[PDB]
Design a protein around this motif. Structure first.
Motif, PDB file in Angstrom:
ATOM      1  N   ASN A   3     -12.421 -20.390 -20.057  1.00 51.13           N
ATOM      2  CA  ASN A   3     -13.843 -20.115 -19.870  1.00 51.13           C
ATOM      3  C   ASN A   3     -14.323 -20.370 -18.433  1.00 51.13           C
ATOM      4  OD1 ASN A   3     -17.032 -21.245 -20.766  1.00 51.13           O
ATOM      5  ND2 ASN A   3     -16.268 -19.230 -21.401  1.00 51.13           N
ATOM      6  N   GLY A   4     -13.552 -21.135 -17.664  1.00 50.02           N
ATOM      7  CA  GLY A   4     -13.936 -21.505 -16.300  1.00 50.02           C
ATOM      8  C   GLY A   4     -13.743 -20.401 -15.274  1.00 50.02           C
ATOM      9  N   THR A   5     -14.165 -20.671 -14.039  1.00 50.66           N
ATOM     10  CA  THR A   5     -14.049 -19.707 -12.941  1.00 50.66           C
ATOM     11  C   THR A   5     -12.599 -19.598 -12.475  1.00 50.66           C
ATOM     12  OG1 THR A   5     -14.454 -21.315 -11.149  1.00 50.66           O
ATOM     13  CG2 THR A   5     -16.394 -20.255 -12.134  1.00 50.66           C
ATOM     14  N   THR A   6     -12.292 -18.531 -11.744  1.00 51.29           N
ATOM     15  CA  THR A   6     -10.925 -18.279 -11.294  1.00 51.29           C
ATOM     16  C   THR A   6     -10.566 -19.150 -10.088  1.00 51.29           C
ATOM     17  OG1 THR A   6     -11.231 -15.964 -11.983  1.00 51.29           O
ATOM     18  CG2 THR A   6      -9.232 -16.486 -10.731  1.00 51.29           C
ATOM     19  N   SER A   7      -9.392 -19.779 -10.151  1.00 56.34           N
ATOM     20  CA  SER A   7      -8.824 -20.517  -9.022  1.00 56.34           C
ATOM     21  C   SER A   7      -7.348 -20.153  -8.882  1.00 56.34           C
ATOM     22  CB  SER A   7      -8.984 -22.027  -9.221  1.00 56.34           C
ATOM     23  OG  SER A   7      -8.320 -22.468 -10.393  1.00 56.34           O
ATOM     24  N   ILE A   8      -6.854 -20.115  -7.644  1.00 57.74           N
ATOM     25  CA  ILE A   8      -5.475 -19.695  -7.373  1.00 57.74           C
ATOM     26  C   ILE A   8      -4.763 -20.590  -6.362  1.00 57.74           C
ATOM     27  CG2 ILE A   8      -5.933 -17.275  -7.914  1.00 57.74           C
ATOM     28  CD1 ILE A   8      -5.895 -16.803  -4.791  1.00 57.74           C
ATOM     29  N   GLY A   9      -3.447 -20.410  -6.270  1.00 53.93           N
ATOM     30  CA  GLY A   9      -2.625 -21.076  -5.265  1.00 53.93           C
ATOM     31  C   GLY A   9      -1.495 -20.169  -4.807  1.00 53.93           C
ATOM     32  N   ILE A  10      -1.257 -20.123  -3.496  1.00 55.91           N
ATOM     33  CA  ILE A  10      -0.176 -19.314  -2.923  1.00 55.91           C
ATOM     34  C   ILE A  10       0.733 -20.183  -2.053  1.00 55.91           C
ATOM     35  CG2 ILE A  10       0.432 -17.289  -1.546  1.00 55.91           C
ATOM     36  CD1 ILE A  10      -2.389 -16.189  -2.115  1.00 55.91           C
ATOM     37  N   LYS A  11       2.032 -20.150  -2.348  1.00 52.05           N
ATOM     38  CA  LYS A  11       3.041 -20.849  -1.554  1.00 52.05           C
ATOM     39  C   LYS A  11       3.528 -19.927  -0.437  1.00 52.05           C
ATOM     40  CE  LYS A  11       7.510 -23.231  -2.120  1.00 52.05           C
ATOM     41  NZ  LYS A  11       8.672 -23.393  -3.037  1.00 52.05           N
ATOM     42  N   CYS A  12       3.380 -20.372   0.810  1.00 49.70           N
ATOM     43  CA  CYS A  12       3.775 -19.580   1.978  1.00 49.70           C
ATOM     44  C   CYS A  12       5.021 -20.174   2.656  1.00 49.70           C
ATOM     45  CB  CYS A  12       2.592 -19.458   2.950  1.00 49.70           C
ATOM     46  SG  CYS A  12       2.087 -20.993   3.752  1.00 49.70           S
ATOM     47  N   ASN A  13       5.357 -19.676   3.848  1.00 51.29           N
ATOM     48  CA  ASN A  13       6.598 -20.049   4.546  1.00 51.29           C
ATOM     49  C   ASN A  13       6.761 -21.539   4.839  1.00 51.29           C
ATOM     50  OD1 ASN A  13       8.038 -17.610   4.721  1.00 51.29           O
ATOM     51  ND2 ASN A  13       6.925 -16.951   6.557  1.00 51.29           N
TER      52      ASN A  13
ATOM     53  N   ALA B 111      -7.473 -21.301  -3.182  1.00 51.65           N
ATOM     54  CA  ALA B 111      -8.741 -20.575  -3.159  1.00 51.65           C
ATOM     55  C   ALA B 111      -9.416 -20.638  -4.525  1.00 51.65           C
ATOM     56  CB  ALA B 111      -8.514 -19.130  -2.744  1.00 51.65           C
ATOM     57  N   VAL B 112     -10.746 -20.561  -4.536  1.00 53.09           N
ATOM     58  CA  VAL B 112     -11.512 -20.638  -5.782  1.00 53.09           C
ATOM     59  C   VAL B 112     -12.785 -19.785  -5.748  1.00 53.09           C
ATOM     60  CG1 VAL B 112     -12.779 -22.732  -5.095  1.00 53.09           C
ATOM     61  CG2 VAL B 112     -12.476 -22.204  -7.530  1.00 53.09           C
ATOM     62  N   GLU B 113     -13.129 -19.234  -6.910  1.00 52.98           N
ATOM     63  CA  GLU B 113     -14.369 -18.491  -7.115  1.00 52.98           C
ATOM     64  C   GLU B 113     -15.487 -19.455  -7.512  1.00 52.98           C
ATOM     65  OE1 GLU B 113     -15.804 -14.926 -10.185  1.00 52.98           O
ATOM     66  OE2 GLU B 113     -14.286 -16.361 -10.845  1.00 52.98           O
ATOM     67  N   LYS B 114     -16.590 -19.429  -6.765  1.00 57.97           N
ATOM     68  CA  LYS B 114     -17.773 -20.234  -7.074  1.00 57.97           C
ATOM     69  C   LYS B 114     -18.933 -19.321  -7.451  1.00 57.97           C
ATOM     70  CE  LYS B 114     -18.823 -23.369  -3.991  1.00 57.97           C
ATOM     71  NZ  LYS B 114     -19.054 -24.018  -2.671  1.00 57.97           N
ATOM     72  N   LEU B 115     -19.316 -19.329  -8.726  1.00 57.86           N
ATOM     73  CA  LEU B 115     -20.404 -18.475  -9.209  1.00 57.86           C
ATOM     74  C   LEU B 115     -21.765 -18.944  -8.697  1.00 57.86           C
ATOM     75  CD1 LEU B 115     -19.405 -17.881 -12.950  1.00 57.86           C
ATOM     76  CD2 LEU B 115     -19.081 -16.309 -11.036  1.00 57.86           C
TER      77      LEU B 115
END
Lengths: 244, 250, 223, 240, 241, 231, 235, 243
Positions: free
Chosen positions: H28-38, H44-48
């Motif tokens: 039910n919550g907002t979208t949040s993500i994580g990306i592993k780089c070099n 990053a996160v969505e704030k309504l």
């Protein structure tokens, strides 16, 4: 959380009864009958073991009659394991009193202490009560020979003759009929065995199904002796009183 | 967190029954048969090693356990409950007796301590009763040889001979016909093996049967010499070979 | 209650027109044994504060870890951790002073004398002292141990009262501090030639100078 | 520890565990208290369902809390022992710290406080006991009689009864007790107390206990024969 | 019917919460196998990485408890790691108190006792895991000891755990009926691993790549896990005969 | 339904009903408004009486010289939470010689409320709070919900009929944020905002409660004839 | 069952709402505040004529400048009174002064919501706390088991409260004398009581700056009852 | 039935329904993500934006642990804060005893064991959050995602909340199209795009983008928030891709 699974062992019914106490008394009514009779020259304790086997080692067995000290003994009706917990506590209380005052504990003081412990389990702690009723047979130099009973409620009363366990209604009527105040120990021994013989659910009353004890001043001069009867001695007293 | 179950889980029902104890006895009834027979010069306790898988090494699972050098125990019912009771029984023999009196407890008093532990699991807050019945055999100087049964309620009784678990009713009848007060230890072992064969379906040999005795002192199992009064343990577990030797004279 | 084992000697400091200066040598003594020769006793906190510590070195290392933890903690859930809500010299001092007084009140002190030197948000000079007893005080010049007896008299000739602070340049102040360190090396048996010096200025920020030496010494007159 | 709230409010504003504790009092044997001009009398019912009883050793219904104050009760017998023990300890504690024995009102206020506490403490049930507390304050000749109940409320009474069929004996006392002229002697007070129990008791034999408390720690329990003489005289006047 | 929610007896003398914990054991849909050699103990387990976003190097159900003891778990990973952390703590404490390395069978007993407590005490739930401990014990030699949610444990000549345990168990039974010995008569651990993988292939009827398996090996004085390339070398040898 | 007996139980859709019921107590409470500019922050609160003989329940509580809040819901819960804020403000001043940042005060309130939503035996707080303050980063306004959710805003309103005041502030956003250096005009905007939530009753001299904090203004509460100027 | 600290779907605590029902069953208590003092009056309500009515204590002194009347489960009030007396005396010990009436009331109300699974349930009694201090003069507060307290010019609690409160709505004005307030409490008590009001089944008290808290004698109240009867017959 | 009324109760399936209901709060919550780089990780996160009255850039959601770990979560925000507070205590005690900052895998288990402990008893409620976290240690970059059950694994990319399916698909494309790896600056740009694309499941209200990162080359292995020009550049890149 945990509240869901709580039986609430210490509550009143709408009628003002304690559920668990009443149900514990129901349990005790299926236990082997125990009888106590008080005479002028001593006290008798007689009790029936529950449907035994031929392979049970009787001479080393004890389920009914227990020694609390040299002057006080108890007959048990109910859960044996529950009784041994309380019995050990009572033995300690008697020794605490002896250490403190350098005198043997008066019978009623010991009875009140055990009864108060039973009472506590009905008012606080949320635990089940002890499924045990006791008959206390004892002697002290204040009141002499005394008989008491206590039950899971923690209530106790004094008696000239009393029964606990199975068929107490029938047993108490038979005792009320034949008991007299000037009775002696040897007469009381006979009354106790005759009463058990009539109230028993077994076909016949034999030595291997009984536990027997006397508290007598039949100890050489002004002192008291406890006698836990041996299997052969129970067999002899059964022949003497003409039951076998 | 915190244990918030401070109330009894075993209570009296309207009929006066303690449900959880009755149900524990039902679990014992489903358990594998074990028995005990007392002779004039010893006691024998025996049971079947019901192996859960043939890949399992059933020698690593001990159903018959030494509690003290002169006291042994066997069970019927829930194995894990038995294992922890053996741990507690071994410890209480030391803490409440040997560390006080400098000697091992007599059979009847160790039985009394185990019984107390089982009684408390029937009244204390937030616990169920133990789902086992125990048979405890032992010897001590002043009481001689003895055999006791302990139930989930905490009640205990002394026996000349008895059986518990699956086929106990039939086994107790078999023992009533064979037992007398003049039996020697070897006679009791013979009767134990005869009785146990009736309740066993599959293989019946030294690898599928667990049997121990309380008998003579074993100075060969003491581990040291030099103290005349120390003569060794009376508890001895019979080997696979020793059982098979007595199965030929069966 | 304990006794100090490995110890550090004087810390000296003073105010000048645009900020504060603080200094301390790099020795860790073990009684009369000059045991450890590379000990840093000035510990910067951010870019606006330098804490100078004397006394027990084990307790100094503990205080150093407390200050490191303080910076970590201040950054938690703090978007302005490097701006308006950064640690001030006054915040750092009050925290240390609280700890010192609490520890003496449990009869288990941190066996140190501490001087916190820095510049506040509004440009004001901050210079205050605290020790194992929880005693605190401020002055245009401050010094611990031997420095109190020998450095203060010299530094007070430059800034004798509050009104002398605006008249004192950073060159004159540093010169005075460096001379005091030489005098302490001549006369304190638990001092070393090597020392560190830190300047906190409201315009040029925090300048931390390591591996400084006492120079221009006179013995020749060994007569 | 066991913390469960057993005494709680219901939608209609009742605490049922306290109210059910009163039902236990209703079941208990009848107890009655009557104060005269210079005495207080406590009467108690003994149910004759229990014979073969040893009356020497059986717990008596009236208990001395101190040499000048007594306590009787209706309800659970085992519960009453706990209140009696606490009251006896407090009486000695009061003598030790204040250097004066308890007033009857103080002792009542303490016992009532204990009862109240057991109605809003976790893991405990209320006492199934109501009490009658009687006596004389130190160096005072004014009679005192108080009542307590499971809820913890208490009050003073010219005359009062508790237990089974107490509705009937209260009816009797309300029409027979005059406030302007209370029983002037010990005789008159005991007579009125025995009369009140005879409305409910059955046989006037070993079913009635009487205890008289007078000023200056003068407390005595009447015997079977002494009570039997009151029983005899009451019915011989009734045959008319 | 609250006798089904907490660990108290049902009218049949059963503990339903324990039985349901056994069912949680198969939630991962992974099968494991353990066998003993002359000098070693080998444990293999299926590895399934269903998401492409996962880092496959972090997906594991084999644990290095101590230097000598390894543990494979059948059940959900949270309960698995709970048991792993505790086993590691117990093994370390044992060595500190008693001055020698905790034996495999003793650790199994200890964890089994802890499990037994959860079946008797109401406030604690059973862990939905089966724990297979492996080592080369200094007294008993190659050892396999397995614990379950009932608090039961026993030693094994070989064992299998998972949804298809019966197929693997019968396959292993049939081999030991032929050989008439309690172990794999092989010198090197490499060939014992090859035996383990071969007999899992036979029993399940599936082929494996290097990323489909997970292998742990116990030798004298160390337990270690194989890399994907070590497993590949093992698979190549199996295919070449 | 079957999942609202305690705070330790999720519903099948992942809801916490005891927390939602606690939120409902706020909606029954009297309206209170919060708004700020760049120099000042203002609280306006409509006080509620029991009857004509009774006093009007106080709504605004001072926490420090630079911080305070207004309440809507269970008043005793506001007393507990405001006492906690007083202590935390105080700890910051005594230990660190530092005025507690308004944002950090919000974080502390969130965490205190959260513990009462995840444990057995306890209950959620039954009150909503509007915290205003002036710290090192200027004026601030926070909204606290007993779910634990704390939010920083230019303006807001909580309590019964709070939606009317909230819409007004959403329209006026560009105007009232610019009211710098004029306390009286900022309060006027707040009094006009809370007026959009009144029905049947109007703002009287013992009805209205106003609080203000700013650049050179300690947190002060105005009641009685001190608010007649704004009626 | 269900938690003792549970919220209803309407956002109210079940146990607090249920305790309010117990207070509705209690005997009536009335308070009236004037510029000459605050009056407190109660219905005694003896259950039987043999009960000595002067042992019924529903009006109680907290300190010389603070009195208190109760309604509901009156046994529950004893620990509240004990706490109030202790708080009043303790503050005098710490500060060498009288405690403010509001501060005393707030201290009592802090006990209210200290229940859960602390005491096992809320209090089943409401209190009218009346007193005087130098800062705010004569004051009357109504302390509930919810932890909330309102100040009142006049207030009635107990079984006859809503009828009495409507009567107090009409009769109270800011110029009432102490004598006028006394008669007013008696008049309204007489209106809502089951039995006929006299000096034995009702009790008066007041708090003034000069004399402090005083419970009225039965003889003093009897005269005020006679004065009431005559002035009602006067029109 | 009744198995879902109490936490820590096994159903006849062998499931803990209370944990499964906690997952519903996460979804039910907002979208949040994580990306592993070099050489690091990006969060990053969505704030309504519920209202215009919300002060922009003020209600910060991403949280730092120690100085090298970043944490973001979807679901009940207070539950996430409680978990981060515990994580901060765990990291502090590790560094106190062992000196070195807590390694990411070590930190992952500390959170895991704590969350798992809230599935063992009926006296506590499971966490209503899924937490994406990670950073740089001595062995390089690590990205983790932790569920209400206590379950966690290492990830190349991770997503949770209402728009998790959309986000996951976008992350899977990046893994396939970049086997060699992604740079830190590229990962910030990609993170902005993915949140903008995932905002379609929350299209009713407009939102505010929040990004953070730890990189060995770009931030010296410390956690920092993406601000100013670099944030605007990422917003522009994101807006260009949706059109």
């Amino acid at each position: 959380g945990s509240r869901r699974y709580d039986s609430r062992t210490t509550i009143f019914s709408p009628e003002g009864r304690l559920y668990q106490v009443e149900y514990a008394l129901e349990s005790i009514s299926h236990a082997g009958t125990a009888i106590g009779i008080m005479a002028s020259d001593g006290i008798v304790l007689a009790a029936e073991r529950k449907v035994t086997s031929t392979l049970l080692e009787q001479d080393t067995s004890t389920e009914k009659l227990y020694k609390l000290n040299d002057k006080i003994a108890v007959a048990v009706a109910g859960l044996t394991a529950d009784a041994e917990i309380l019995i050990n506590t009572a033995r300690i209380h008697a020794q605490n009193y002896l250490k403190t005052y350098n005198e043997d504990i008066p019978v009623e003081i010991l009875v009140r202490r055990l009864s108060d412990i039973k009472q506590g389990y009905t008012q606080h702690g949320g635990l089940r009560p002890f499924g045990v009723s006791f008959i206390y047979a004892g002697y002290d130099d204040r009141y002499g020979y005394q008989l008491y009973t206590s039950n899971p409620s923690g209530n106790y009363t004094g008696w000239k003759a009393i029964s606990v366990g199975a068929n107490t209604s029938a047993a108490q009527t038979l005792l009320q009929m034949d008991y007299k105040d000037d009775m002696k120990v040897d007469d009381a021994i006979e009354l106790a065995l005759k009463t058990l013989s009539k109230t028993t659910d077994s076909s016949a009353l034999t030595y291997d199904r009984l536990e027997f004890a006397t508290i007598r001043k039949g100890a050489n001069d002004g002192e008291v002796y406890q006698k836990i009867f041996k299997p052969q001695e129970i067999k002899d007293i059964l022949v003497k009183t003409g039951i076998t | 967190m915190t244990d918030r179950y401070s109330f009894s889980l075993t209570t009296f029902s309207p009929s006066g029954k303690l449900g959880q104890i009755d149900y524990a006895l039902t679990a014992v009834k489903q358990g594998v048969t074990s028995l005990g027979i007392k002779a004039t010069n010893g006691v024998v306790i025996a049971t079947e090693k019901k192996s859960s898988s043939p890949l399992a090494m059933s020698e690593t699972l001990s159903k018959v356990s030494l509690l003290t050098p002169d006291i042994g125990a066997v069970y019927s019912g829930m194995g894990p409950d038995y294992r922890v009771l053996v741990d507690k029984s071994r410890k209480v023999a030391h803490t409440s007796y040997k560390r006080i009196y400098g000697e091992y407890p007599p059979t009847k008093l160790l039985v009394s301590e185990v019984a107390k532990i089982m009684q408390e699991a029937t009244q204390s807050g937030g616990v169920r009763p133990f789902g086992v019945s125990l048979l405890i055999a032992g010897h001590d100087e002043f009481n001689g040889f003895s055999l006791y049964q302990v139930d989930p309620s905490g009640s205990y009784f002394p026996w000349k001979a008895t059986a518990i678990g699956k086929g106990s009713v039939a086994a107790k009848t078999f023992l009533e016909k064979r037992w007398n007060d003049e039996l020697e230890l070897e006679d009791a072992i013979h009767i134990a093996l005869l009785t146990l064969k009736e309740s066993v379906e599959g293989e019946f040999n030294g690898d599928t049967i667990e049997l121990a005795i309380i008998g003579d002192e074993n100075p060969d199992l003491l581990g040291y010499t030099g103290i005349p009064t120390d003569k060794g343990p009376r508890f001895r577990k019979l080997t696979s070979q020793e059982i098979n030797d007595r199965l030929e004279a069966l | 209650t304990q006794q100090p084992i490995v110890t550090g000697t004087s810390v000296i400091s003073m105010k000048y027109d645009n900020g504060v200066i603080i200094a301390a040598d790099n020795l860790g003594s073990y009684g009369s044994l000059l045991r450890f020769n590379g000990v840093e006793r000035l510990i910067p906190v951010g870019d606006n504060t330098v804490v100078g510590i004397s006394g027990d070195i084990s307790d100094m290392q503990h205080i150093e870890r407390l200050l490191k933890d303080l910076v970590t903690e201040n950054a938690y859930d703090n978007p302005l951790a490097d701006a308006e809500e950064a640690l001030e010299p006054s915040y750092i001092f009050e925290y240390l002073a609280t700890v010192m007084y609490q520890r003496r009140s449990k009869m288990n002190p941190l066996w140190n004398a501490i001087i916190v030197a820095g510049v506040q948000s509004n440009g004001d000079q901050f210079l205050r002292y605290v020790n194992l007893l929880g005693v605190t005080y401020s002055s245009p010049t401050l010094a611990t141990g031997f420095g109190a007896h020998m450095a203060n008299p010299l530094l007070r000739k430059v800034v004798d009262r509050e009104s002398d602070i605006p008249k004192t340049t950073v060159q004159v102040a540093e010169e005075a501090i460096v001379n005091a360190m030489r005098v302490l090396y001549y006369r304190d048996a638990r001092s070393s030639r090597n020392f560190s010096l830190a300047i906190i200025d409201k315009n040029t920020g925090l300048t931390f100078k390591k591996n400084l030496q006492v120079e221009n010494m006179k013995w020749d007159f060994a007569k | 520890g066991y913390d469960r709230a057993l005494s709680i409010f219901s939608p209609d504003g009742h605490i049922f565990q306290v109210e059910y504790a009163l039902e236990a009092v209703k079941r208990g044997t009848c107890a009655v208290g009557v104060k005269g001009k210079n005495c207080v009398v406590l009467g108690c019912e003994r149910r004759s369902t229990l014979k073969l009883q040893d009356t020497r050793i059986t717990p008596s219904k009236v208990s001395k809390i101190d040499s000048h104050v007594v306590l009787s009760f209706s309800g659970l017998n085992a519960d009453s022992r706990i209140l009696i023990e606490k009251a006896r300890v407090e009486a000695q504690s009061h003598r030790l710290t204040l250097e004066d024995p308890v007033t009857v009102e103080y002792l009542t206020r303490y016992v009532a406080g204990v009862q109240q506490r057991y109605t809003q403490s976790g893991g405990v049930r209320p006492f199934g006991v109501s009490t009658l507390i009687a006596g004389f304050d130190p160096r005072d000749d004014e009679p005192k009689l108080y009542q307590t109940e499971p809820s913890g409320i208490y009050s003073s009474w010219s005359a009062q009864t508790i237990g089974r069929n107490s509705k009937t004996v209260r009816e009797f006392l309300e029409k027979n007790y005059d406030r302007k002229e209370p029983p002037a002697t010990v005789e008159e007070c005991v007579k009125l107390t025995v009369r009140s129990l005879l409305e409910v008791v059955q046989t006037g034999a070993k079913n009635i206990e009487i205890t008289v408390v007078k000023p200056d720690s003068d407390i005595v329990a009447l015997s079977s024969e002494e009570i039997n003489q009151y029983v005899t005289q009451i019915e011989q006047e009734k045959q008319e | 019917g609250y006798d089904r929610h907490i660990t108290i007896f049902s009218p049949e003398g059963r503990l339903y919460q324990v039985e349901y914990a056994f069912k949680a054991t198969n939630q991962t849909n992974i099968n494991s196998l353990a066998v003993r050699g002359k000098d070693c103990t080998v444990v293999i387990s299926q590895k399934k990485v269903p998401d492409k976003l996962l880092d496959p190097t972090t997906v594991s159900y084999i644990f290095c408890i101590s230097r000598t003891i390894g543990m494979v778990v059948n059940g959900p990973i949270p309960d698995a790691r709970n048991a792993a952390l505790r086993a590691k703590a117990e093994a370390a404490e044992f060595r500190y108190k008693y001055g020698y390395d905790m034996p495999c069978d003793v650790l199994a007993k200890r964890m089994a006792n802890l499990s037994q407590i959860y079946t008797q005490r109401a406030y604690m739930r059973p862990l939905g895991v089966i724990l297979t401990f492996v080592s080369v014990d200094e007294e008993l030699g190659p050892s396999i000891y397995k614990t379950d949610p009932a608090g039961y444990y026993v030693g094994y000549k070989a064992t299998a755990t998972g949804p298809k345990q019966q197929e693997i168990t019968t396959n292993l039974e049939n081999h030991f009926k032929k050989s008439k010995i309690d172990h794999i008569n092989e010198e090197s651990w490499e060939k014992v691993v090859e035996f383990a993988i071969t007999h899992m292939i036979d029993a399940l009827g599936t082929e494996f790549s290097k990323n489909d398996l997970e292998v742990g090996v116990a030798t004298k004085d160390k337990f270690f896990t194989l890399s994907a390339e070590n497993i590949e070398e093992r698979l190549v040898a199996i295919a070449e005969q | 339904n079957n999942y609202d007996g305690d705070t330790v139980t999720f519903s099948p859709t992942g809801r916490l009903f005891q927390v939602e019921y606690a939120l409902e107590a706020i909606k029954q409470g009297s309206v209170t408004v919060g708004l700020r500019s760049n120099t000042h922050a203002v609280l306006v609160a409509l006080k509620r009486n029991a009857d004509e003989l009774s006093s009007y329940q106080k709504k605004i509580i001072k926490c420090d010289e630079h911080m305070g809040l207004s309440l809507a819901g269970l008043a005793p819960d506001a007393r507990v939470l405001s006492n906690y804020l007083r202590q935390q403000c105080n700890y910051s001043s005594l230990v660190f010689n530092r005025k507690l940042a308004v944002e950090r005060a919000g974080h502390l309130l969130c965490d205190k409320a959260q513990k009462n939503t995840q444990s057995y035996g306890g209950r959620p707080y039954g009150v909503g709070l509007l915290i205003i303050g002036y710290d090192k980063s200027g004026a601030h306004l926070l909204e606290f919900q007993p779910s634990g959710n704390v939010t920083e805003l230019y303006g807001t309103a909580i309590g019964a009929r709070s939606q009317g005041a909230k819409t007004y502030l959403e329209r006026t956003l560009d105007t009232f944020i610019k009211i710098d250096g004029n306390p009286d005009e900022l309060i006027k905007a707040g009094v006009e905002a809370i007026s959009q939530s009144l029905r049947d009753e109007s703002l009287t001299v013992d009805n209205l409660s106003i609080a203000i904090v700013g650049k050179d203004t300690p947190f002060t509460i105005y009641d009685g004839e001190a608010v007649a100027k704004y009626i | 069952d269900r938690g003792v600290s549970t919220f209803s779907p309407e956002g109210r605590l079940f146990q607090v709402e249920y305790s309010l029902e117990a207070i509705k069953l209690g005997s009536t208590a009335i308070g009236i505040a004037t510029k000459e003092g605050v009056v407190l009056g109660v219905e005694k309500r003896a259950t039987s004529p043999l009960l000595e009515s002067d042992s019924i204590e529903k009006i109680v002194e907290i300190d010389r400048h603070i009195g208190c009347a109760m309604s509901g489960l009156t046994a529950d009030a004893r620990s509240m009174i004990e706490h109030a007396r202790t708080a009043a005396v303790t503050h005098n010990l710490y500060y060498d002064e009288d405690i403010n009436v509001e501060s005393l009331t707030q201290s009592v109300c802090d006990l209210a919501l200290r229940f859960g699974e602390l005491m096992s349930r809320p209090f089943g009694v409401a209190l009218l706390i009346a007193g005087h201090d130098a800062d705010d003069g004569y004051q009357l507060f109504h302390a509930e088991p919810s932890g909330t307290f309102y100040r009142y010019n006049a207030k009635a609690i107990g079984s006859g409260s809503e009828g009495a409160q409507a009567e107090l709505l009409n009769e109270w004005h800011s110029s009432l004398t102490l004598k006028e307030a006394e008669l007013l409490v008696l008049k309204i008590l007489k209106q809502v009581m089951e039995e006929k009001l006299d000096e034995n089944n009702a009790q008066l008290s007041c708090i003034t700056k000069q004399d402090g808290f005083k419970i009225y004698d039965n003889e003093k109240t009897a005269e005020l009852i006679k004065e009431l009867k005559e002035k009602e017959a006067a029109e | 039935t009744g198995y879902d009324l109490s936490n820590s109760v096994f159903s006849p399936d062998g499931r803990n329904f209370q944990v499964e209901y906690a997952v519903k709060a996460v979804e039910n919550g907002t979208t949040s993500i994580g990306i592993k780089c070099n050489d690091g990780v990006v969060f990053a996160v969505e704030k309504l934006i519920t209202s215009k009255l919300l002060v922009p850039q003020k209600n910060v959601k991403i949280q730092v642990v120690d100085r090298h770990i970043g944490c973001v979560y979807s679901g009940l925000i207070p539950d996430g804060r409680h978990l981060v507070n515990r994580g901060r205590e765990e990291a502090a005690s590790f560094k106190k005893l062992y000196k070195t900052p807590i390694p990411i895998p070590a930190f992952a288990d500390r959170l895991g064991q704590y969350v798992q402990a809230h599935t063992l008893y009926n006296s506590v409620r499971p966490f209503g959050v899924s937490t994406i976290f990670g950073g740089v240690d001595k062995n390089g970059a690590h990205l983790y995602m932790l569920e209400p059950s206590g379950s966690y694994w290492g990830y190349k990319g991770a997503a949770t909340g209402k728009g998790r399916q959309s986000a996951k698909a976008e992350l899977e494309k990046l893994v396939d199209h970049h086997p060699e790896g992604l740079s830190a600056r590229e990962a910030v740009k990609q993170a902005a795009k993915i949140i903008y694309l995932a905002h379609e499941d929350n299209k009713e209200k407009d939102f505010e983008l929040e990004i953070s990162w730890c990189s060995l080359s770009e931030t010296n292995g410390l956690h920092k928030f993406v601000k100013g020009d670099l944030l605007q550049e990422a917003i522009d890149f994101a807006q260009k891709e949706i059109n």
